[PDB]
């Protein structure tokens, strides 16, 4: 354990322990910062360029940071609503909604910050703003079957060698990691449909209710049978096997 | 193979070299230029041919070999004789024979195969006098041009690894005492010291070290770093070995391109002639130091020349930079301290160990020593590799080196650093080269390919380019990068074909600003640069392309040319170069271009002899 | 059957230590003239490591190709150097003489299109090279020389 | 840890506050759906209510890779909502289906004891939910049956 820094935030004094972020300062601090692309769960990857902050330090001009990875190291001041800030957000977050112009998370930070989409600037909106949450997301449950396939404006996340992914689970982590809805992950029975995959349901035998499919549960290694089991129905029959004893 | 056990080995092998040198100085020994430069221009069909005239010359025929680029590339096929220390230029096969039977056998000195001044019109009998030449200091390039690159004997008789062997002997504290107080800033563009770079490495104590060689050249038109590791490997390789000596590093990497082939191969082969001679392995000359070089080779991607970009192409995932607020001296390959320096870092750090710390000093400007190369490329009359001392003005390299411009066309920019860098107009041509410097115009040292615009280059159109460069070379990691990039495409795409406005132009301005300073890495931070420079310089050539009027005449359709009625020799070029046959003039007389026939393509202008047809702007009345 | 054994004698030659993984792509390339998805599976088999890292890899770099090339490359430099002496109009005049575009192979399979970003030679600008023979200080006119000659000659070496 | 829940299903009425509570105190809302304790009713009124118990060797925290499943100081394995990728293995790990997943959430839901002041003992009328030490984990229920014995 280190000796916490004092830092201040938009005017307000905190002691932040050593090596933490400025978005974790001002998350403590109940001071709000826009991101896109970071996740608590996934190793942080500085994408969007979205929670950019302005970083004062004694006899140094403010400079942009991004406060989702950006550490607390020595005694400086973030400014969250200047000018540089203001301006800076305004870019990424016009460049964002012109990628993907139908999403509702990027029209409602267009509207906080006062942001149209342009039909100039608007080359090939696939509604994907190359956050990388997904590929994350795979990347830390294990299957590592989705990942980014090109670079510049063609940069793409896509199954490997543009097939029904040979790796993939059917968990559907990597749709429910997505701010854009771009993934989308359809269940019609007992089939369930992500990266134009097919994938088997599991029925519990006395509900007819799913929540995972059979590769995931192969996967987890999970030989026990009431696995299968909706967990509504796997309480009801565990608790069936407590004799109480009315006398 | 000589493996040598001890110093006192190398420095005898050494001796017993210089002494065959010595008894081997009236052998008439012919070297041929073989770098990329030249080997395209074909001079290996000129090294085959002397091979085989040579044969059956006495009892012993002449020497012939192979080496690195000289240098004046504008040249092509570069043949050195030994026997009068000859410079050949434009050598050709046919040539092959003449100068064997006059040159090296009769003494005789080919008089039309000499170079020639353009200027006072003088015959150069040797390099050194070469006004190209005359005014370089070739410290680091030394031995490039004179000695066969794949033979470590030329190198060890050239004074080569000795540098190692007083190393051994100051220590690894000495070592890096010496290289911070040499003043070494790094030659991969960033200017940062070496010696705080190789110190901070030390420091950290989690062990194994590595340093590394970053042989990517991703700038284009810029081979100087290409042109050092074909030249001589050997310089790099002493380098990597003092580095790690300093640093305690074991292992050493050298990241090339898979589509340099000539200097992979060269790189192997000096590594395979290294191990065999002790200078690689284990215990290194008996100073029980064992280090080991391989050779990283990767595909061609400019992002891949970043640091934290090539330490995963390294590992073995794609080349894309990642955001870090730890050094690559702390946490770089495999999260282990790395030192990663350019191979010209490399390269002088045996010229800062045999010639001492004091004498390397005497060079350059104050807090930039030493000297740098220059890819001189561009519209000069002198292309190649340029080395100079810090603090040269910009106006000796393009005029006394570079020669001017091409043909006689007014200077108007220079670009340095390429897409990382800005350009310069003609007003500032006084400028020290140094690092500080030219990052003050707002420009870059960079790379060191020097870009060279004269009135037939539009800058407008000159920023599109970097700009598409950019695009197609983005890694697409992060949103300013993927997509501002984009957005000044398009704004530069409506500008160079008349769709523009001054509106466009202020959003242009606004989108380079924010891109600069929102990126992730150095390519999309610098990546505005190029823009911002012609903005700040050249902002009325970005107005008359909002007017639709294209001054250098690159735009096509935005102009219309002119035919000048005094100084046109009626030769007709023009009139049988354009595609509209829009060209009406007397024959052999001055010729006449009509305003609404002619639609602007550039094609008559460049092949004017007089020069005496440039743009004009378009009746837009009717 | 002779694919796998050429790949399993590629995929022996290298250790199975992941750091190889793009060495042994670029022999894979220069075996077959592209990417086929049997061989980048089998890459990625032999390293022990995710099929779409492989893929990443194989489509970062534009050397790298998922569909076969022709049989002669043509490769025409855009650096900066040989944009300013015209590199554009070559690379038009190429572009339309062969309908195609950049990074796209003919209808008859023999040449493929490609633009590099330097070759080394910019004194002698604009350049261009086919296979590995090198041309510069080449116009518009001599485009047509130099694609037609390579391509009969090209269908002689062949067969 | 300090204290635990005990559960004594041949107190259980069956009436559900336990489960109301729950969702009011979690949701904000009266949804019993999701609650942390469920009860179950069988023939004969016996009902038994079924929530997490803080297995001390916990597979649900050996299933999760996002490391959203933790032990606090209390002994609690608690759910780090903003950690959990909605992978659903902690689901099929636990062999009493006591984790559920709270779809509109997207977060893994199991009891919590509440940090401490369970409201679903607060309100069981009957006692079938308790809050105890855990060094008296079964104390009470010895003592109601010694009790037997001691009327003779
Ligand atoms: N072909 C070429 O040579 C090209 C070079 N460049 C140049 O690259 C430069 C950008 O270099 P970057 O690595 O992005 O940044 P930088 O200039 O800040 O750092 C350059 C080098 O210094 C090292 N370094 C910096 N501070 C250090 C410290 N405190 N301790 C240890 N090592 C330290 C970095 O790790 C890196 O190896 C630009 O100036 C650009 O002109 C860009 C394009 C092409
Ligand atoms: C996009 C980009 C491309 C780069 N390309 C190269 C390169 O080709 N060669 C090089 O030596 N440095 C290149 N660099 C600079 C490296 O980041 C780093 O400074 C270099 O590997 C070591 O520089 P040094 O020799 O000054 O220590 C590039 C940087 C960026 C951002
Ligand atoms: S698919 Fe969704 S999560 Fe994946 S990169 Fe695109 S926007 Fe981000
Ligand atoms: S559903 Fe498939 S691709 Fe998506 S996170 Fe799960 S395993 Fe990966
Ligand atoms: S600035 Fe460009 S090259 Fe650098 S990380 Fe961002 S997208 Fe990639
Ligand atoms: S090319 Fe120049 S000199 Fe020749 S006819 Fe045309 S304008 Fe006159
Ligand atoms: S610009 Fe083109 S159309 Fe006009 S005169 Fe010259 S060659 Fe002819
Ligand atoms: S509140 Fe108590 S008595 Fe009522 S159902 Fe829940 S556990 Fe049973
Ligand atoms: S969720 Fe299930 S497995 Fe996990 S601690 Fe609770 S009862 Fe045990
Ligand atoms: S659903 Fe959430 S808590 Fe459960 S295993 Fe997956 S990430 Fe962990
Ligand atoms: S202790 Fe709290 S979280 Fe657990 S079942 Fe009772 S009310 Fe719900
Ligand atoms: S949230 Fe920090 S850069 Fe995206
Ligand atoms: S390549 Fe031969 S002089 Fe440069
Ligand atoms: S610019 Fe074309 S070879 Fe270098
Ligand atoms: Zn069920």
Redesign the interface.
Known sequence: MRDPIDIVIDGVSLSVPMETTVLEAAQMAGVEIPTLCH????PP??????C?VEILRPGRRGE?A?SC???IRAQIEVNTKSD?VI??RK??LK??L??APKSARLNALANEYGVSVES??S?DPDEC??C?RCVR?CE???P????????????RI????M?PP??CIG???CA??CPTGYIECVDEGDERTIWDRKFTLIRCPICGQT??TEE??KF?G?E?P??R????????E???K?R???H | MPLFLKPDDLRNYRLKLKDDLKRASLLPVVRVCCGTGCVSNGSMEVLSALEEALKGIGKVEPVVKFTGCHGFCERGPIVIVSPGEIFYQNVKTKDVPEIVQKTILDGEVIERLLYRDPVTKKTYRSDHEIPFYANQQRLVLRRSGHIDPTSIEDYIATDGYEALCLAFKLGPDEIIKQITDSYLRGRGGGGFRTGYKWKSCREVDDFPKYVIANGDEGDPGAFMDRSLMEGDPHSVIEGMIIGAYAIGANEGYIYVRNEYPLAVRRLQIAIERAREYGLLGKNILGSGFDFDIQICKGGG?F?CGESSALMRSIEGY?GVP??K?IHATEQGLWDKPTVLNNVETWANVPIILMNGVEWYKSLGTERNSGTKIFALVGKVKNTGLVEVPMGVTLRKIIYEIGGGTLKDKAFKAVQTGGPSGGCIPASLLDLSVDFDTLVKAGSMMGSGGMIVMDERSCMVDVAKYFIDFL??????????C??????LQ?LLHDLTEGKGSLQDVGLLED?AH??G????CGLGKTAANPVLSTLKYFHEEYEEHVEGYCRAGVCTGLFAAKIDKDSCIGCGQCARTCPVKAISGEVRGPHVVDALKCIGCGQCMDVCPTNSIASSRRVKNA | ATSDVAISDILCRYEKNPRFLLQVLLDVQEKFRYLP?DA??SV?EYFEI???????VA??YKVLSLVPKGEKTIKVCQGTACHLRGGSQILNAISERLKIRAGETTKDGIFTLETVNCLGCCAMAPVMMVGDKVYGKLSVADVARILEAEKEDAIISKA | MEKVLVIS??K?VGCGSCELACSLEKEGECRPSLARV?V?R?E?????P?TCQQCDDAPCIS?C????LARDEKNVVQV?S????????C???????????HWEQ?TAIKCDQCNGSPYCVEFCPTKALDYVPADAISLQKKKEFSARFAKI
């Open positions: 996740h608590p769960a996934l990857d500085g994408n969007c360029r979205l950019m942009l991004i990875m950006y550490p540089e301006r800076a870019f990424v460049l964002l012109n990628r100039r600037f080359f703003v190359r990388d997301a830390t449950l294990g590592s079957a989705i990942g980014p396939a090109w670079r510049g404006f063609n940069k896509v199954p490997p060698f097939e040979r790796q968990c559907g982590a429910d990691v929540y995972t995931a549960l987890t999970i026990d009431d696995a089991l909706c967990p509504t129905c796997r309480k009801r565990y608790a069936s407590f109480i004893f009315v | 991607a992002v794609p990642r955001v607020y695009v197609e070379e983005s890694c697409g990691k992060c949103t300013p993927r997509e501002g990039l984009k957005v398009k989108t924010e891109l300073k929102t990126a992730l | 998805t980048m599976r990625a995710p099929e779409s890292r492989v893929f990443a489509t970062f | 299903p041949e259980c469920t179950y069988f004969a009124g016996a009902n038994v079924m299933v890779k996002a490391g959203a780090d903003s950690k959990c990728i909605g992978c659903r293995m689901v099929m790990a636990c062999p009493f289906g006591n984790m559920s997943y997207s």
